[PDB]
């Protein structure tokens, strides 16, 4: 059998100040236990007495015995002074029920209730169940109720009486994954230079876990961390990674990686480390070009270079060229490695052909490329009488061809007239002499 407690009723009221006297009748007596809230006490006498007053005595009394036997009795000490016993701690996990420790020292009251501070009314959605032995319980605590502040309240003699004051706090359950962003995108460096890259995380909570790791290896690198709380349920972290001095081995994928109890995400970036620097050149047109008098031509180069260009120059026939040319990057992106220059020859006069050359410099390399130029000219023609033979003389790049009816061509001949005519792709011209 369990042990018998005298008197055997479930519950007892006692005056503040009155004596409290409880006996447990079992051959197997072992123990007395006393519990309220988190306070706890034990006794090894088989009888429990306390002549003095304390309200705090209120709560639960338990007796236990040899074969395993146990019985309990519950007790009130009615105090007009102390209607509640209280504990100002209050915390809830999102989406679970939560308990407010304001259990009642005298059960003979009604309209046992929960109420909002300073007159302000409680949000409508709360539903809660009371109990005098525990205090009062709030269902399904949800993110609206954060920092909400509370009284629990009772009516005695029609007068309405209030607990000491409570502030509720809620800690969130993750509905969604971390959010991950990286300071700049992809990196290229001349050897033996410091390398520094930053990764940033926005998330609901300070509990989030985040790391840097290098592709194909699990050595965690050294990293340094900084954080801010931008308001409720709003947490931010930044992490920075550094290599003081690059060696070419350092090239490859790097990954910023984040995790919480809902799932995960990353961002990747790639570093290329190069030993030295280069300039590489491509013409937009064939290197040698053919153009008519007063015609117009533009010459173009596209080139890839690192480090950045030091100067471009444009020069002709042991002489300068000046102020008829443009040079600008092929793209505005931070990544930009590629560059173009164009140079105009316009209303080109017929003798100015020859060789046009472009030169470019950077810190490590110099590179030069040349174009050659020949002029389409309409035939230009002239006459010289030699002995008995009459000669017809004409020049143009490319050669003129002649009929009777710079390259130089000559034609020699064996009432009315001698007409001598030459044609080229560029134009035609002619000569006249006559006999009577």
């Amino acid at each position: 059998s369990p042990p018998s407690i005298h008197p055997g009723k479930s519950d007892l009221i006692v005056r503040v100040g009155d004596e409290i006297r409880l006996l447990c009748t079992d051959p197997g007596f072992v123990k007395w236990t006393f519990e309220i809230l988190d306070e706890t006490n034990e006794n090894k006498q088989n009888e429990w007495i306390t002549e003095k007053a304390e309200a705090t005595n209120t709560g639960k009394y338990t007796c236990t015995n040899k074969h395993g036997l146990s019985n309990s009795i519950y007790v009130f000490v009615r105090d007009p002074a102390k209607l509640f016993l209280v504990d100002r701690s209050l915390y809830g996990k999102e989406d679970n029920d939560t308990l407010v420790r304001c259990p009642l020292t005298d059960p003979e009251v009604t309209n046992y209730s929960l109420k909002g501070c300073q007159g302000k009314p409680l949000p409508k959605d709360l539903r809660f169940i009371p109990d005098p032995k525990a205090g009062i319980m709030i269902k399904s605590v949800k993110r609206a109720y954060h920092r909400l502040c509370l009284h629990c309240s009772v009516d005695q003699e029609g007068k309405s009486v209030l607990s000491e004051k409570f502030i509720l706090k809620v800690r969130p359950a993750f509905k969604a994954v971390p959010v991950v962003s990286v300071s700049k995108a992809s990196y290229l460096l001349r050897e033996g230079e410091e390398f520094t890259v930053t990764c940033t995380i926005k998330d609901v909570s300070s509990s989030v876990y985040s790391t840097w790791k290098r592709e194909n290896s699990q050595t965690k690198l050294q990293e340094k961390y900084n954080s801010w709380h931008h308001g409720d349920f709003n947490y931010e972290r930044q992490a920075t990674l550094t290599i003081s001095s690059a060696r070419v081995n350092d090239s490859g994928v790097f990954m910023c990686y984040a995790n919480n109890t809902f799932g995960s995400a990353n961002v990747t970036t790639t570093l290329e480390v190069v030993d030295k620097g280069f300039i590489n050149i491509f013409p937009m047109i064939n290197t040698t070009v053919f153009v008519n008098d007063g015609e117009n031509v533009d010459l173009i180069v596209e080139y890839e270079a690192f480090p950045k260009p030091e100067h471009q120059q444009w020069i002709y026939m042991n002489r300068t060229f000046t102020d008829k040319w443009e040079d600008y990057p092929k793209s505005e992106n931070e990544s930009n490695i590629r560059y173009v220059s164009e140079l105009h020859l316009t209303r080109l006069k017929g003798t100015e052909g020859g060789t046009y050359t472009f030169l470019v410099s950077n810190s490590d390399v110099n590179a030069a490329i040349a174009f050659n130029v020949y002029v389409n000219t309409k035939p230009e023609i002239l006459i010289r009488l030699v002995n008995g033979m009459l000669q017809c003389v004409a020049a143009g790049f490319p050669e003129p061809t002649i009929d009777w009816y710079k390259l130089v061509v000559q034609s020699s001949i064996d009432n009315g007239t001698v007409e001598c005519k030459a044609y080229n792709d560029v134009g035609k011209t002619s000569a006249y002499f006559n006999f009577a």
Binding site: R88, Y91, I167, R171, S206, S227, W228, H229, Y235
Partner: protein, 121 residues
Amino acid sequence: ICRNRVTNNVKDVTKLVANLPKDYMITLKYVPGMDVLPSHCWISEMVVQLSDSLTDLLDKFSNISEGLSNYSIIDKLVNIVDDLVECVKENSSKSPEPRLFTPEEFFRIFNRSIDAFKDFV
């Protein structure tokens, strides 16, 4: 462990001290001998008491949007200490007498309490 829960904001504590009247009074239950004994004895009770006292103090000011009101700073510090409480209650897994402090001293007690985590079993 837990060291990452203390965001860097704590530097603001020096600003906050300067703007409170040097004879305003702040009220704390103070663990006796906590100045003396090794950290791991007192720290558990202390960190609870701080969170309580601070949430009381927060009622006293009023928010404004412009700049750094005292109300802003205090609101953030509360968010730090509560998650330390959870971290200890979940990773480590009697009430002193009430006491009064001037601002400078009180914050000193707080600041040393934070420092105890930068190396803790």
